Amino acid sequence: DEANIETHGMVPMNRLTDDPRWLPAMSERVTRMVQRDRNHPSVIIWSLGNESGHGANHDALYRWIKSVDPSRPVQYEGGGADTTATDIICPMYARVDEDQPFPAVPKWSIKKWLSLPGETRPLILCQYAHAMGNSLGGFAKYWQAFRQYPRLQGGFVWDWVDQSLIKYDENGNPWSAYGGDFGDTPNDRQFCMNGLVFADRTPH
Amino acid sequence: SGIFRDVSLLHKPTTQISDFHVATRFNDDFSRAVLEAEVQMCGELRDYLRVTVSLWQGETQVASGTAPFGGEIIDERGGYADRVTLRLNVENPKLWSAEIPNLYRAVVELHTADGTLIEAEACDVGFREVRIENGLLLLNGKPLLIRGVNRHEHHPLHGQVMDEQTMVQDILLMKQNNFNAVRCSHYPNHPLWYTLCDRYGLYVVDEANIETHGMVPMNRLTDDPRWLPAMSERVTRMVQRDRNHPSVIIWSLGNESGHGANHDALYRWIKSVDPSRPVQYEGGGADTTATDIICPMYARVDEDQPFPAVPKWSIKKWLSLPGETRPLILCQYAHAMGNSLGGFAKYWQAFRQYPRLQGGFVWDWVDQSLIKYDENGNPWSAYGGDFGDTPNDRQFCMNGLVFADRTPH
Ligand SMILES: OC[C@H]1O[C@@H](OC[C@H]2O[C@@H](O)[C@H](O)[C@@H](O)[C@@H]2O)[C@H](O)[C@@H](O)[C@H]1O
Ligand SMILES: OC[C@H]1O[C@@H](OC[C@H]2O[C@@H](O)[C@H](O)[C@@H](O)[C@@H]2O)[C@H](O)[C@@H](O)[C@H]1O
Ligand SMILES: [Mg+2]
Ligand SMILES: [Mg+2]
Ligand SMILES: [Mg+2]
Ligand code: NA
Ligand code: NA
Ligand code: NA
Ligand code: NA
After folding, report:
1. Which of A69, B49, B253, B275 has the fewest CB neighbours in a 10 Å radius?
2. What order do you get walking across the sheet with B357-362 strand by strand?
3. Ligand 2 pocket, residue B97 CB under 6 Å
4. Choosing among A97, A112, A146, which should be mutated to test the B contact, i.e. which has the most B CBs within 10 A?
């Protein structure tokens, strides 16, 4: 269960989450979620949101949850996937054997990440295998690694269902539309369709 | 069998230096060091006796300390009146490593206050710190990448007798072939070897002469307290002999003797007596309580071999097993028997990618073949069974990167 906090478009990404003036608004997104959902057995992990860098507001909120509900781990991927605001190394799109050593926020091979000096946490990818279009090549390589390494405890595929929307042609017949099809601009075109299933639930 | 290393006579004074230990400690950036030397005497104590420890860089004396005997109080009965510890401050020391084997000379003099020398002892000193931190084996604060080989003391004509020319030949070929480390498989070596490794620059794993491989199970003796005394001397007397060589960076408790409580006792003894070097030991699964380094033999890079009790996990996976944090350096890997070394690049790629995979020691340097002569008197290379020996293990004695005469494979 994940708080409704994503500030991906900021530059740098943590511009708001490291600003104390935004701590109150962020706090309510996290606290009100825990107050609503904490009795559901299906929730096993809380997440602090998505793609909002790593700011001090995250560390304050991580600790709040750890205090109020010690029954569930807290994870958060921003700022490098392995910051002090996450109990689980939870990268997005880290590869199985290939490192992508981006500055400040490298994406190590998952097998390598587990054993970096001093690291001891489990690793569960918050997003992996981007199923956009004809994709999922290399899926098996993840599963072989998850089964061989105890601390590679799986992951969440990206993602379930294409976000295509229905439009109707001049003859009234429906068709699947994506970014820019409503006059929207700028837009990111077909990047909204990344699912294992089509919007109507037919499998890819 | 036989008397296969040197025999000598040594004439010491009755009041003499009976032992000395040199340690070097550093500040955070290695810009300052303290050399501390504990010196012990035998003989009759006299108030006019003194010890001076002097440190030389070439022909220049850089530090010195002099004191009478009498150590600090250590317990309710006092201290060692027959010992003294000198402490020398050394600014910006030249550090020792296999890359640049900088050495100083320490001279330990037992003398009188008014200047007469009774006798002197001395050693080459390499300033370096070896420690494991955060899962990495560091030398002078930097993480090593061990390009090692295991080397037996073997000569095809002389057997297990070692000579300077051969040792030098081996070191030169090792360095010329990008090795920086050697494991004394599986016993303390001829004394000259450590002096050469100190001077030419190779990291050394010094290993006690204890291997009980043929027991069933392998720890039958090493888990038996009645064998603790015999084992103990093999480890303690090695540390007593070799502790002042800078090239020795890691102590090993022996080889292929399972994992017994005697190992745990001896591991602890070394950690108490010499905190300056990690202790490793592979027996009993390579990651037991008796080793500071996961040090398997022939663990594969990607492939697990999950043997009961003593599995050989893929080295990449081993590092990350739940709770594990130690560095991993293979004590033996890539078995170079005959036409072999297939797969060698796979190890290197992994060692460079994983910080905590810090290398390994290839098995092994030189084939143990022996020369025999045909009726013609022409020589030929012999292996197991060729002397009528039986049972024997045939050509398993030839696993070297070089032939017995040092020609490369
Ligand atoms: O389905 C789209 C996918 O995009 C991911 O971001 C892609 C790539 O876009 C660049 O604009 C960013 O600066 C770069 O860091 C980023 O990796 C995003 O991580 C996923 O959550 C998803 O939206
Ligand atoms: O160069 C020989 C090599 O033998 C290694 O042991 C090999 C093999 O011996 C068999 O008797 C056992 O069934 C098996 O478990 C063992 O692996 C030894 O580990 C090396 O140190 C080396 O002598
Ligand atoms: Mg666009
Ligand atoms: Mg003098
Ligand atoms: Mg046989
Ligand atoms: Na797993
Ligand atoms: Na998308
Ligand atoms: Na490495
Ligand atoms: Na052999």
Report:
1. B275
2. B279-280, B248-252, B203-207, B181-183, B146-150, B357-362, B328-333
3. no
4. A112
